[PDB]
């Protein structure tokens, strides 16, 4: 806790505003208040006279829609000196330094004699407010010129909290009174005096616009405008009582900003509605109560950390929208009522003001998730969560924050279509003042109902919405809008539910003799798409059935049909970004491949079923030693193979899956390593012998393994299942492990580092391999999208020629971090969302100084405890102490199975590791500069090849895409198994052998999967090389040089660049075609 507290202090002083600017601004607006007092008074005038007064003036009255017409504006207008006040965070001295800048809220109270008791009806008060503001801007402008301040002051109108009914004047300073360096903007808010209108008449249930429907939005704007100083007095008292109020407030402000929350209006579409004020008011309401028993949830003696935690805990658990609402008295203990108004409500009995009227239901649900999510990180003790909670912005990219994004292009967008605009109608104008408010809800309700359980949270964003307009204009002017609609296009952002996002059928109300209300709306909503169907269990329900595709999810089809039917038949819905990612995943050559969802693992299970058939055969055989267990450790057994298994597709590199066969413990095992390996082969011979005789339908052949260095006697039995699958069997013996340790002990001191590397590979294949496949398989079922994203990530690596050096297991462990450690984001729910999160993590991962350690556990045991967590941390510091620059080891990936952390990340050359992060940094930079679009994705998946010193082009004799099981194909194995090599790609083996010979001089890379990244025919592969800087220049001739070089002098030799190509060329034989240097 002490570490957290000191972190809090460091954060607070970092964001603390510099006191010099406070005097600088305080010098200015103090002089500003003199100018306002200079403004003269004014006489009664009707709309006709004020229009003539402002007819020629540069200023224009910002009348609120509907603009006052002569017939209904019989009431007159007047102006008098305001009762000036300062409010906001600045008044409470709770502001922080913001690079984008802050705002100083100056309130001008309209004198009460200017109003009538019934001026809160039919926008009477608002229209009086508009002229009162316009008159101020007129006289303020000339006085600003008089004092010569106009040179560096820019004036413009804007909406308070993006509220269309409350235009305000914004004063900003461009580059003695110049406060540009302060980064502040003075806002002039024209409020009403307290208690001018009977607040009971202004309750959310009541109405104030005659047309009866309630007007929560209009009632709030007038009522909140009349209650500004009262809340300042409320907050001032609480600040004195508890000494840590301001520190807690800034913590909430910082937390809200990172999640992209603001006090601005949410009915228009933008995410917000809790700002610092709502966080501050809610904390005050909790300090004087909050419990159902009206007991205090926060104590004035609480510290900053405690105060922040309570409000976060309050939001996370107790519901303020559907079931329950919180009432308090600003001017009386705050009590939580169980009843709910079906909208976010934080009622104030003293003021009769609901502080969360600006909030939409959809945005409220997202915060409750965010508040709940942080409450979990806040309770976390093993890992520090300060940076994730406060020092990480998740709103920078909508794709990373939202699983799916659909942009809907509305028709006729210099006004919305007559049919579309006609839907707005007079009735919804009363409920929803602006069309943008109306349309945002219309999209949300139909989209929410249509998708139903398929989604968790939905956000509707009106892209390109402005809130400030020049003084010469009355309303915001959008280029597409034409003063009609303040938006270019609307975007639908979704948080899908992986469990049910891909259900083929949308279940509905059950059948009944009389159609129920729920059944009626279901049939009306879906129209022809609705149908009544029966199932195996015998239930008769109204349901509609869709069709799965391998290019797009079901949700894309539903929203398109749902929005078009109800919103507008001309709407254009398009999410191409998800479509491109889906296509980049290889398409298997199975029946009905195109119609399979990307979440379907039926191909993998078919491989397992074939393995089970072989699994039974092996045990029932009789051998000298009984079979202890058969453990499959192949890629396809953990749903990670890049291309799904396809029967008889033996050209795929991942065709032959490794299986660990273990016998009973015996004391007769050979004590010599080569004898032990040949003892294992002898058992495999008998397994092949009995398998060949008893089950002739299985075919088998023997292949050698050299992955473990210096153990050249390993022989693995390859079994070709009749179903069309291949399995590779290797024998594990208990004596095998201790024999390697014996080698290390007996090895000379200088060779011991070499031998342990050999042991490191053996454990990665035999011992650690079993654990990794076990944990990853079980976890993958909870993380549905893990299998596609990791496959696509491996596809991304291969295009850039990195899989040749990055072992597979390292690739999964990096790709699973967004799932096991989703903070500060959510668990990925889409292929697009998941893949980009992996790139984001690598981009910001400083592997030199920060280790990566994972809790491979299902969503909230085997979670790392504090002792284990510190133990792995101590391992990293020991390694970095010996390897500070990180030359020997780059990526430290550890978990319960691998506490050492060097098991799956050893042997990677430094240029490759930097290249991986270098590509990630460019990818994120590319996305920031250019938004996610078709061109950007193609650039992501296209490899440069220009950085490499020399590039070698290879072509296979025959296209391998068909035999790899990739649908742009063999149906039986060759009669002579020697013919298998004829349909294999050997360039991967060439690179491996070339790397060993030229380890000291060259680093060669190639595309492991040629069928996917080898063109249309899958026959083109490329070998790229890198000359180390040392041997790039000339060197003195020495015996220990260890490189192919050409002399220039008696003792000067240079890298024999041309000869190495002759070496590389002749391996290819017919394969190599062209060279680039």
């Amino acid at each position: 806790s002490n570490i957290f507290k000191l972190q809090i202090d460091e954060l607070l002083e970092q964001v603390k505003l510099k006191q010099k600017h406070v005097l600088k601004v305080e010098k200015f607006l103090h002089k500003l208040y003199d100018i306002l007092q200079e403004i003269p008074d004014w006489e009664e005038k009707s709309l006709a006279e004020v229009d003539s007064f402002f007819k020629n003036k540069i200023v224009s009255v910002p009348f609120v829609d509907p603009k006052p017409i002569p017939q209904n504006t019989n009431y007159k207008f007047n102006y008098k000196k305001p009762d000036i006040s300062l409010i906001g965070s600045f008044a409470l001295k709770a502001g922080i330094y913001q690079p984008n800048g802050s705002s100083i809220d100056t309130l001008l109270t309209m004198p009460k004699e200017l109003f009538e008791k019934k001026d809160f009806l039919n926008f009477r008060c608002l229209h009086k407010r508009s002229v009162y503001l316009a008159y101020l801007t007129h006289h303020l402008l000339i006085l600003l010129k008089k004092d010569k301040l106009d040179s560096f002051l820019q004036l413009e109108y804007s909406y308070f909290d993006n509220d269309p009914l409350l235009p305000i004047l914004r004063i900003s300073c461009s580059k003695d009174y110049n406060f540009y360096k302060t980064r502040f903007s003075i806002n002039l808010l024209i409020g009403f005096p307290y208690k001018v209108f009977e607040p009971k008449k202004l309750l959310p249930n009541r109405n104030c616009i005659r047309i009866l429907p309630a007007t929560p939005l209009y009632n709030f704007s007038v009522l909140s405008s009349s209650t500004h100083e009262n809340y300042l007095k409320y907050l001032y008292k609480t600040k004195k009582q508890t000494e840590s109020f301001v520190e807690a407030t800034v913590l909430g402000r910082l937390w809200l900003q990172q999640r992209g929350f603001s006090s601005n209006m949410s009915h228009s579409g933008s995410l917000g509605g809790f700002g610092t004020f709502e966080f501050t008011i809610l904390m005050a309401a909790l300090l004087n109560g909050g419990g159902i028993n009206s007991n205090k949830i926060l104590l004035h003696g609480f510290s900053s950390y405690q105060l922040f935690k309570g409000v976060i805990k309050y939001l996370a658990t107790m519901d303020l929208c559907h079931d329950g609402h919180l009432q308090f008295h600003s001017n009386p203990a705050s009590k939580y009522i169980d009843e709910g108004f079906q909208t976010p409500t934080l009622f104030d009995k003293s003021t009769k003001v609901n502080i969360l009227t600006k909030m939409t239901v959809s945005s409220y649900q997202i915060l409750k998730e965010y508040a709940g999510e942080t409450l979990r990180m806040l309770n976390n003790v093993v890992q520090d969560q300060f940076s994730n909670i406060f020092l990480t912005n998740i709103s920078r990219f909508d794709n990373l924050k939202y699983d799916l994004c659909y942009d809907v292009q509305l028709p006729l967008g210099n006004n919305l279509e007559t049919s579309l605009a006609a839907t707005f109608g007079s009735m919804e104008r009363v409920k929803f003042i602006t069309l943008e408010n109306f349309l945002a809800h219309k999209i949300t309700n139909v989209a929410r109902y249509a998708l139903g359980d398929r989604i968790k949270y939905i956000q509707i964003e009106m892209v390109g919405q402005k809130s400030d307009f020049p003084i010469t204009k009355r309303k915001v002017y959008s280029n597409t809008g034409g003063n009609h609609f303040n938006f270019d296009f609307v975007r639908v952002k979704l948080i899908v539910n992986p469990s049910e996002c891909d259900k083929l059928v949308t279940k509905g109300p059950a059948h009944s003799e009389t159609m129920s209300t729920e059944a009626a709306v279901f049939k009306n909503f879906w129209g022809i798409k609705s149908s009544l169907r029966r199932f195996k269990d015998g239930s008769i329900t109204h349901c509609c059935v869709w069709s799965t595709s391998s290019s797009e999810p079901i949700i894309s089809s539903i929203v398109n049909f749902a929005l078009q039917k109800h919103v507008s038949k001309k709407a254009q819905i398009s999410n191409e970004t998800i479509k491109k990612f889906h296509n980049f995943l290889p398409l298997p050559n199975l029946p009905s491949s195109a119609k399979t969802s990307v979440l379907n693992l039926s191909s993998f299970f078919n491989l397992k079923k074939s393995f089970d058939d072989l699994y039974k055969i092996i045990f029932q055989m009789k051998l000298p030693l009984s079979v202890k267990s058969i453990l499959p450790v192949g890629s396809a057994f953990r749903y990670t193979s890049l291309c799904q298994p396809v029967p008889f597709a033996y050209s795929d590199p991942d065709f032959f899956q490794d299986v660990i066969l273990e016998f009973e413990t015996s004391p007769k095992w050979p004590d010599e390593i080569t004898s032990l390996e040949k003892a294992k082969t002898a058992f495999l011979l008998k397994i092949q012998e009995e398998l060949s005789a008893n089950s002739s339908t299985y075919r088998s052949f023997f292949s050698r393994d050299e992955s473990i260095p210096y153990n050249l006697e390993i022989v693995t039995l390859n079994i070709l299942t009749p179903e069309g699958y291949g399995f590779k069997f290797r024998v594990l013996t208990e004596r095998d492990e201790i024999l390697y340790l014996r080698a290390i002990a007996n090895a000379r001191n200088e060779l011991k580092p070499e031998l342990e590397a050999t042991f490191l590979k053996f454990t990665a294949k035999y011992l650690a391999s079993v654990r990794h496949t076990r944990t990853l398989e079980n976890i993958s079922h909870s993380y549905q999208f893990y299998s596609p994203v990791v496959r696509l990530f491996k596809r991304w690596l291969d295009t850039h020629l990195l899989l040749g050096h990055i072992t597979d297991e390292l690739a999964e462990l990096i790709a699973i971090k967004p799932f096991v450690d989703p903070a500060p984001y959510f668990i990925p729910g889409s292929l697009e969302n998941g893949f980009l999160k992996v790139l984001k993590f690598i981009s910001q991962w400083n592997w030199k100084d920060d280790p990566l350690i994972l809790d491979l556990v299902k969503p909230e045991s085997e979670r790392l405890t504090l002792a284990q967590y510190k133990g792995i941390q101590m391992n990293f510091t020991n390694l970095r102490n010996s390897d500070p620059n990180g030359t020997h080891l780059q990526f430290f990936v550890a978990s319960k199975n691998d506490p050492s952390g060097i098991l799956y990340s050893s042997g990677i050359p430094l240029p490759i590791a930097t290249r991986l992060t270098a590509l990630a940094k460019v990818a994120v930079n590319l996305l920031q500069t250019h938004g996610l679009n078709q061109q950007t994705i193609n650039l992501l998946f296209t490899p440069g090849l220009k950085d490499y010193d020399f590039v070698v082009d290879l072509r296979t004799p025959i296209g391998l895409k068909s035999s790899c099981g990739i649908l742009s194909a063999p149906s039986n194995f060759p009669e002579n198994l020697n013919d298998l090599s004829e349909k294999m790609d050997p360039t991967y083996q060439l690179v491996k052998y070339l790397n060993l010979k030229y380890k000291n001089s060259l680093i060669l890379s190639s595309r492991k999967y040629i069928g996917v990244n080898g063109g249309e025919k899958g026959d083109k592969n490329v070998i790229t090389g890198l000359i180390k800087p040392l041997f790039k220049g000339a060197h003195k001739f020495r015996v220990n040089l260890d490189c192919n070089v050409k002399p220039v002098d008696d003792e000067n030799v240079i890298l024999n660049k041309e000869a190495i190509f002759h070496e590389i060329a002749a391996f290819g034989n017919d394969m190599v075609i062209n060279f680039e240097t």
Binding site: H800, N846, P911, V922, L939, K946, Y948, P1029
Partner: peptide, 13 residues
């Protein structure tokens, strides 16, 4: 295309 100069000093970090 997605091109990044090759770094051998880990300077990108």
């Amino acid at each position: 295309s997605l091109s990044a100069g090759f770094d051998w000093t880990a300077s990108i970090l």
